[PDB]
Amino acid sequence: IDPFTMGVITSESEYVSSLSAEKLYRGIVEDGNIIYPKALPRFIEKAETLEGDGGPGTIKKLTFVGDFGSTKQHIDMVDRENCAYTYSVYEGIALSDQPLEKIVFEFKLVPTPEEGCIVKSTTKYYTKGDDIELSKDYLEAGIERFEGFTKAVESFLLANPDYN
Amino acid sequence: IDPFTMGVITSESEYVSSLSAEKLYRGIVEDGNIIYPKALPRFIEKAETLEGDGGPGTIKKLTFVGDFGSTKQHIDMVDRENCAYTYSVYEGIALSDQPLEKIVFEFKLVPTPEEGCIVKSTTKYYTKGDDIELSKDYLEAGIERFEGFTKAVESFLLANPDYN
Numbered sequence: 001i002d003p004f005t006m007g008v009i010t011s012e013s014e015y016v017s018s019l020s021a022e023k024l025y026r027g028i029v030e031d032g033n034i035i036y037p038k039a040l041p042r043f044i045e046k047a048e049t050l051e052g053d054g055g056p057g058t059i060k061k062l063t064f065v066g067d068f069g070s071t072k073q074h075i076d077m078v079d080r081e082n083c084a085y086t087y088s089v090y091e092g093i094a095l096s097d098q099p100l101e102k103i104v105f106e107f108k109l110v111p112t113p114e115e116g117c118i119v120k121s122t123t124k125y126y127t128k129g130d131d132i133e134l135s136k137d138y139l140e141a142g143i144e145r146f147e148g149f150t151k152a153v154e155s156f157l158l159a160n161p162d163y164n
Numbered sequence: 165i166d167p168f169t170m171g172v173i174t175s176e177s178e179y180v181s182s183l184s185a186e187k188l189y190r191g192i193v194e195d196g197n198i199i200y201p202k203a204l205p206r207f208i209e210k211a212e213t214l215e216g217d218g219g220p221g222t223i224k225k226l227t228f229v230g231d232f233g234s235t236k237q238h239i240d241m242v243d244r245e246n247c248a249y250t251y252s253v254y255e256g257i258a259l260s261d262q263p264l265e266k267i268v269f270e271f272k273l274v275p276t277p278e279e280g281c282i283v284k285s286t287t288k289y290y291t292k293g294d295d296i297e298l299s300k301d302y303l304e305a306g307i308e309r310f311e312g313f314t315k316a317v318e319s320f321l322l323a324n325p326d327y328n
Protein backbone atom coordinates (compact mmCIF):
# COMPACT_ATOMS: atom_id res chain seq x y z
CA ILE A 1 0.00 0.00 0.00
CA ASP A 2 1.24 3.46 -1.17
CA PRO A 3 4.34 2.42 -3.16
CA PHE A 4 7.12 4.32 -4.92
CA THR A 5 6.99 4.11 -8.75
CA MET A 6 9.34 5.51 -11.42
CA GLY A 7 9.87 4.82 -15.11
CA VAL A 8 12.97 4.98 -17.28
CA ILE A 9 12.50 4.91 -21.08
CA THR A 10 15.69 4.33 -23.08
CA SER A 11 16.07 5.02 -26.81
CA GLU A 12 19.09 3.94 -28.83
CA SER A 13 20.31 4.79 -32.27
CA GLU A 14 23.52 4.22 -34.20
CA TYR A 15 25.05 5.28 -37.48
CA VAL A 16 28.46 5.00 -39.16
CA SER A 17 30.52 8.15 -39.70
CA SER A 18 33.57 8.49 -41.93
CA LEU A 19 35.01 11.03 -39.47
CA SER A 20 37.43 9.74 -36.83
CA ALA A 21 36.11 9.26 -33.32
CA GLU A 22 38.66 11.70 -31.88
CA LYS A 23 37.81 14.51 -34.31
CA LEU A 24 34.07 14.19 -33.79
CA TYR A 25 34.44 13.97 -30.02
CA ARG A 26 36.69 17.02 -30.04
CA GLY A 27 34.21 19.04 -32.10
CA ILE A 28 31.18 18.17 -29.97
CA VAL A 29 32.71 18.28 -26.51
CA GLU A 30 35.78 20.49 -26.47
CA ASP A 31 34.97 22.93 -29.29
CA GLY A 32 31.18 22.89 -29.12
CA ASN A 33 31.10 26.49 -27.94
CA ILE A 34 32.61 27.49 -31.30
CA ILE A 35 31.10 24.82 -33.55
CA TYR A 36 27.40 24.90 -32.60
CA PRO A 37 26.43 28.30 -34.09
CA LYS A 38 28.30 27.44 -37.29
CA ALA A 39 27.07 23.83 -37.46
CA LEU A 40 23.46 24.44 -36.34
CA PRO A 41 23.00 28.05 -37.44
CA ARG A 42 19.21 27.80 -37.70
CA PHE A 43 18.94 26.53 -34.11
CA ILE A 44 21.82 27.58 -31.86
CA GLU A 45 22.45 31.27 -31.47
CA LYS A 46 25.18 30.85 -28.85
CA ALA A 47 26.90 28.10 -26.85
CA GLU A 48 28.70 28.84 -23.59
CA THR A 49 29.80 27.11 -20.44
CA LEU A 50 28.46 28.71 -17.26
CA GLU A 51 30.41 26.91 -14.54
CA GLY A 52 33.26 24.42 -14.53
CA ASP A 53 36.19 23.55 -16.75
CA GLY A 54 34.39 20.96 -18.91
CA GLY A 55 34.78 17.90 -16.71
CA PRO A 56 32.02 16.11 -14.82
CA GLY A 57 29.84 18.60 -12.97
CA THR A 58 30.09 21.35 -15.61
CA ILE A 59 27.03 23.37 -16.67
CA LYS A 60 26.89 24.50 -20.31
CA LYS A 61 24.15 26.69 -21.78
CA LEU A 62 22.82 26.73 -25.33
CA THR A 63 20.88 29.88 -26.17
CA PHE A 64 18.54 29.52 -29.14
CA VAL A 65 18.07 31.58 -32.26
CA GLY A 66 15.20 34.02 -32.08
CA ASP A 67 12.74 33.75 -29.24
CA PHE A 68 13.00 30.07 -28.21
CA GLY A 69 14.77 30.58 -24.89
CA SER A 70 17.65 28.38 -23.81
CA THR A 71 18.61 25.03 -22.33
CA LYS A 72 21.10 24.13 -19.59
CA GLN A 73 23.24 20.99 -19.83
CA HIS A 74 24.63 19.42 -16.63
CA ILE A 75 27.71 17.48 -17.64
CA ASP A 76 27.81 14.12 -15.92
CA MET A 77 30.51 11.87 -17.44
CA VAL A 78 33.46 13.00 -19.59
CA ASP A 79 35.83 10.46 -21.13
CA ARG A 80 38.05 11.75 -23.94
CA GLU A 81 39.93 8.45 -24.01
CA ASN A 82 36.89 6.38 -25.07
CA CYS A 83 34.95 9.25 -26.71
CA ALA A 84 32.11 8.97 -24.20
CA TYR A 85 30.08 11.98 -23.03
CA THR A 86 26.95 12.26 -20.89
CA TYR A 87 24.79 15.11 -19.64
CA SER A 88 21.42 15.81 -18.08
CA VAL A 89 18.66 18.32 -18.74
CA TYR A 90 16.08 19.02 -16.04
CA GLU A 91 13.93 21.72 -17.66
CA GLY A 92 13.50 23.39 -21.01
CA ILE A 93 12.04 23.10 -24.49
CA ALA A 94 13.72 19.68 -24.75
CA LEU A 95 11.11 18.54 -22.20
CA SER A 96 8.19 19.79 -24.36
CA ASP A 97 5.42 20.02 -21.72
CA GLN A 98 5.62 16.21 -20.99
CA PRO A 99 5.68 14.82 -17.40
CA LEU A 100 9.47 14.44 -17.05
CA GLU A 101 11.88 14.62 -14.12
CA LYS A 102 14.98 14.70 -16.31
CA ILE A 103 16.45 13.60 -19.63
CA VAL A 104 19.90 12.02 -19.88
CA PHE A 105 21.75 12.26 -23.22
CA GLU A 106 24.54 9.71 -23.83
CA PHE A 107 26.96 9.70 -26.72
CA LYS A 108 29.74 7.17 -27.47
CA LEU A 109 31.99 6.93 -30.55
CA VAL A 110 33.58 3.61 -31.53
CA PRO A 111 36.46 3.57 -34.06
CA THR A 112 36.09 1.55 -37.24
CA PRO A 113 39.03 -0.10 -39.03
CA GLU A 114 38.62 2.39 -41.89
CA GLU A 115 39.39 5.12 -39.33
CA GLY A 116 35.76 6.12 -39.26
CA CYS A 117 33.70 5.59 -36.17
CA ILE A 118 30.33 4.24 -35.10
CA VAL A 119 28.20 6.96 -33.47
CA LYS A 120 26.10 5.62 -30.60
CA SER A 121 23.36 7.90 -29.28
CA THR A 122 21.20 7.19 -26.25
CA THR A 123 18.40 9.13 -24.63
CA LYS A 124 16.92 8.22 -21.24
CA TYR A 125 13.61 9.77 -20.11
CA TYR A 126 12.83 9.70 -16.36
CA THR A 127 9.17 9.82 -15.26
CA LYS A 128 7.43 9.83 -11.88
CA GLY A 129 4.90 7.17 -10.99
CA ASP A 130 1.53 8.87 -11.45
CA ASP A 131 1.77 9.61 -15.18
CA ILE A 132 3.68 7.13 -17.33
CA GLU A 133 2.30 8.44 -20.63
CA LEU A 134 4.90 9.18 -23.28
CA SER A 135 4.10 9.28 -26.98
CA LYS A 136 6.00 6.90 -29.25
CA ASP A 137 6.19 9.85 -31.62
CA TYR A 138 7.56 12.09 -28.86
CA LEU A 139 10.16 9.56 -27.69
CA GLU A 140 11.69 9.07 -31.12
CA ALA A 141 11.65 12.77 -32.00
CA GLY A 142 13.99 13.29 -29.05
CA ILE A 143 16.56 10.72 -30.16
CA GLU A 144 16.18 11.95 -33.75
CA ARG A 145 16.89 15.58 -32.76
CA PHE A 146 19.88 14.40 -30.72
CA GLU A 147 21.41 12.15 -33.37
CA GLY A 148 20.71 14.82 -35.97
CA PHE A 149 22.62 17.28 -33.83
CA THR A 150 25.62 14.95 -34.04
CA LYS A 151 25.22 14.56 -37.82
CA ALA A 152 25.24 18.36 -38.21
CA VAL A 153 28.50 18.64 -36.29
CA GLU A 154 29.82 15.74 -38.36
CA SER A 155 28.75 17.61 -41.49
CA PHE A 156 30.51 20.74 -40.27
CA LEU A 157 33.84 19.06 -39.48
CA LEU A 158 33.83 17.11 -42.75
CA ALA A 159 33.48 20.39 -44.65
CA ASN A 160 35.91 22.37 -42.43
CA PRO A 161 38.82 20.16 -41.34
CA ASP A 162 41.03 23.12 -40.41
CA TYR A 163 38.72 25.31 -38.28
CA ASN A 164 41.62 25.80 -35.73
CA ILE B 165 15.27 6.84 -37.98
CA ASP B 166 14.04 3.54 -36.40
CA PRO B 167 15.56 3.51 -32.88
CA PHE B 168 15.41 0.75 -30.30
CA THR B 169 13.21 1.88 -27.40
CA MET B 170 12.50 0.11 -24.13
CA GLY B 171 10.96 1.19 -20.83
CA VAL B 172 11.46 -0.11 -17.30
CA ILE B 173 8.83 0.78 -14.71
CA THR B 174 9.89 0.08 -11.12
CA SER B 175 7.61 -0.19 -8.06
CA GLU B 176 8.92 -0.59 -4.50
CA SER B 177 7.31 -1.37 -1.18
CA GLU B 178 8.54 -2.11 2.34
CA TYR B 179 6.95 -3.39 5.48
CA VAL B 180 8.22 -4.68 8.79
CA SER B 181 7.71 -8.38 9.42
CA SER B 182 7.37 -10.00 12.82
CA LEU B 183 9.10 -13.13 11.53
CA SER B 184 12.89 -13.30 11.59
CA ALA B 185 14.61 -12.96 8.20
CA GLU B 186 15.95 -16.52 8.33
CA LYS B 187 12.53 -18.10 8.88
CA LEU B 188 10.73 -15.94 6.33
CA TYR B 189 13.44 -16.46 3.71
CA ARG B 190 13.44 -20.22 4.23
CA GLY B 191 9.66 -20.36 3.96
CA ILE B 192 9.43 -18.22 0.82
CA VAL B 193 12.46 -19.39 -1.15
CA GLU B 194 13.57 -22.83 -0.01
CA ASP B 195 10.22 -24.32 1.10
CA GLY B 196 7.80 -22.71 -1.35
CA ASN B 197 6.70 -25.93 -3.03
CA ILE B 198 5.31 -27.06 0.32
CA ILE B 199 4.34 -23.70 1.79
CA TYR B 200 2.60 -21.92 -1.09
CA PRO B 201 -0.55 -24.14 -1.28
CA LYS B 202 -0.92 -24.16 2.50
CA ALA B 203 -0.35 -20.40 2.89
CA LEU B 204 -2.48 -19.23 -0.06
CA PRO B 205 -5.06 -22.03 -0.28
CA ARG B 206 -7.64 -20.00 -2.21
CA PHE B 207 -5.02 -18.98 -4.79
CA ILE B 208 -2.16 -21.51 -5.16
CA GLU B 209 -3.26 -25.05 -5.93
CA LYS B 210 0.19 -26.51 -6.58
CA ALA B 211 3.83 -25.38 -6.66
CA GLU B 212 6.49 -27.51 -8.31
CA THR B 213 9.99 -27.35 -9.75
CA LEU B 214 10.31 -28.01 -13.47
CA GLU B 215 14.04 -27.60 -13.89
CA GLY B 216 16.95 -27.01 -11.54
CA ASP B 217 17.76 -27.72 -7.90
CA GLY B 218 16.52 -24.44 -6.47
CA GLY B 219 19.55 -22.32 -7.33
CA PRO B 220 19.88 -19.70 -10.06
CA GLY B 221 18.38 -20.99 -13.30
CA THR B 222 15.58 -22.95 -11.68
CA ILE B 223 12.12 -22.97 -13.25
CA LYS B 224 9.18 -23.19 -10.85
CA LYS B 225 5.55 -23.63 -11.88
CA LEU B 226 2.62 -22.42 -9.81
CA THR B 227 -0.79 -23.82 -10.68
CA PHE B 228 -3.66 -21.59 -9.61
CA VAL B 229 -7.02 -22.41 -8.12
CA GLY B 230 -9.71 -22.54 -10.78
CA ASP B 231 -9.27 -21.46 -14.39
CA PHE B 232 -6.28 -19.13 -14.29
CA GLY B 233 -3.69 -21.40 -15.87
CA SER B 234 -0.23 -21.31 -14.36
CA THR B 235 2.84 -19.14 -14.03
CA LYS B 236 6.47 -20.08 -14.61
CA GLN B 237 9.08 -18.30 -12.51
CA HIS B 238 12.68 -18.22 -13.71
CA ILE B 239 14.93 -17.95 -10.68
CA ASP B 240 17.76 -15.45 -11.14
CA MET B 241 19.43 -14.73 -7.79
CA VAL B 242 19.37 -16.90 -4.67
CA ASP B 243 21.39 -15.65 -1.73
CA ARG B 244 20.49 -17.15 1.65
CA GLU B 245 23.21 -15.19 3.45
CA ASN B 246 21.74 -11.83 2.43
CA CYS B 247 18.11 -13.06 2.17
CA ALA B 248 17.85 -11.93 -1.45
CA TYR B 249 15.69 -13.60 -4.12
CA THR B 250 14.95 -12.66 -7.73
CA TYR B 251 12.96 -14.18 -10.55
CA SER B 252 11.39 -13.24 -13.86
CA VAL B 253 7.99 -13.98 -15.36
CA TYR B 254 7.44 -13.88 -19.12
CA GLU B 255 3.81 -14.95 -19.58
CA GLY B 256 0.77 -15.84 -17.51
CA ILE B 257 -1.92 -14.32 -15.33
CA ALA B 258 0.71 -12.15 -13.67
CA LEU B 259 0.97 -10.24 -16.98
CA SER B 260 -2.81 -9.97 -17.66
CA ASP B 261 -2.80 -8.59 -21.24
CA GLN B 262 -0.55 -5.75 -20.53
CA PRO B 263 2.01 -4.95 -23.26
CA LEU B 264 4.93 -6.55 -21.43
CA GLU B 265 8.17 -8.29 -22.30
CA LYS B 266 8.77 -9.53 -18.73
CA ILE B 267 8.32 -8.71 -15.05
CA VAL B 268 11.26 -9.01 -12.63
CA PHE B 269 10.42 -9.60 -8.96
CA GLU B 270 12.98 -8.89 -6.23
CA PHE B 271 12.56 -9.91 -2.61
CA LYS B 272 15.02 -8.70 0.00
CA LEU B 273 15.04 -8.99 3.81
CA VAL B 274 16.95 -6.65 6.14
CA PRO B 275 17.38 -7.73 9.79
CA THR B 276 16.08 -5.30 12.38
CA PRO B 277 17.24 -5.11 16.03
CA GLU B 278 13.75 -6.16 17.23
CA GLU B 279 14.70 -9.45 15.52
CA GLY B 280 11.91 -9.00 13.02
CA CYS B 281 12.96 -7.81 9.61
CA ILE B 282 12.29 -5.27 6.90
CA VAL B 283 10.63 -6.83 3.87
CA LYS B 284 11.74 -5.11 0.68
CA SER B 285 9.64 -5.85 -2.43
CA THR B 286 10.38 -4.64 -5.94
CA THR B 287 8.61 -5.25 -9.24
CA LYS B 288 10.15 -4.19 -12.54
CA TYR B 289 8.01 -4.00 -15.67
CA TYR B 290 9.77 -4.32 -19.03
CA THR B 291 7.76 -2.93 -21.97
CA LYS B 292 8.57 -2.53 -25.64
CA GLY B 293 8.97 0.89 -27.26
CA ASP B 294 5.80 0.91 -29.37
CA ASP B 295 3.34 1.64 -26.59
CA ILE B 296 4.78 2.52 -23.17
CA GLU B 297 1.38 2.98 -21.49
CA LEU B 298 0.97 1.19 -18.15
CA SER B 299 -1.83 1.96 -15.75
CA LYS B 300 -0.72 3.20 -12.33
CA ASP B 301 -3.66 1.21 -10.97
CA TYR B 302 -2.29 -1.92 -12.61
CA LEU B 303 1.24 -1.24 -11.33
CA GLU B 304 0.30 -0.67 -7.73
CA ALA B 305 -2.00 -3.67 -7.68
CA GLY B 306 0.96 -5.77 -8.76
CA ILE B 307 3.29 -4.65 -5.99
CA GLU B 308 0.41 -4.90 -3.51
CA ARG B 309 -0.34 -8.48 -4.57
CA PHE B 310 3.37 -9.35 -4.39
CA GLU B 311 3.94 -7.84 -0.96
CA GLY B 312 0.62 -9.35 0.13
CA PHE B 313 1.80 -12.82 -0.85
CA THR B 314 4.78 -12.45 1.50
CA LYS B 315 2.53 -11.35 4.38
CA ALA B 316 0.29 -14.39 3.94
CA VAL B 317 3.30 -16.70 4.05
CA GLU B 318 4.43 -14.83 7.15
CA SER B 319 1.10 -15.46 8.86
CA PHE B 320 1.21 -19.11 7.89
CA LEU B 321 4.77 -19.57 9.19
CA LEU B 322 4.04 -17.81 12.48
CA ALA B 323 1.01 -20.07 12.88
CA ASN B 324 2.91 -23.27 11.93
CA PRO B 325 6.48 -23.04 13.26
CA ASP B 326 7.00 -26.82 13.17
CA TYR B 327 5.98 -27.47 9.58
CA ASN B 328 9.38 -29.27 9.25
Ligand SMILES: O=C(O)c1cccc(C(=O)c2ccccc2)c1
Pocket residue numbers: 192226249258271306309310311313314
Ligand atom coordinates in the same frame (compact mmCIF):
# COMPACT_ATOMS: atom_id res chain seq x y z
O1 LIG C 1 3.16 -11.47 -7.67
C1 LIG C 1 2.41 -12.33 -7.12
O2 LIG C 1 1.22 -12.03 -6.82
C2 LIG C 1 2.91 -13.73 -6.80
C3 LIG C 1 2.05 -14.78 -7.04
C4 LIG C 1 2.42 -16.07 -6.78
C5 LIG C 1 3.67 -16.31 -6.26
C6 LIG C 1 4.54 -15.27 -6.00
C7 LIG C 1 5.90 -15.67 -5.41
O3 LIG C 1 6.36 -16.72 -5.72
C8 LIG C 1 6.65 -14.80 -4.39
C9 LIG C 1 8.00 -14.99 -4.20
C10 LIG C 1 8.68 -14.20 -3.29
C11 LIG C 1 8.03 -13.23 -2.54
C12 LIG C 1 6.67 -13.06 -2.70
C13 LIG C 1 5.99 -13.83 -3.64
C14 LIG C 1 4.16 -13.96 -6.27
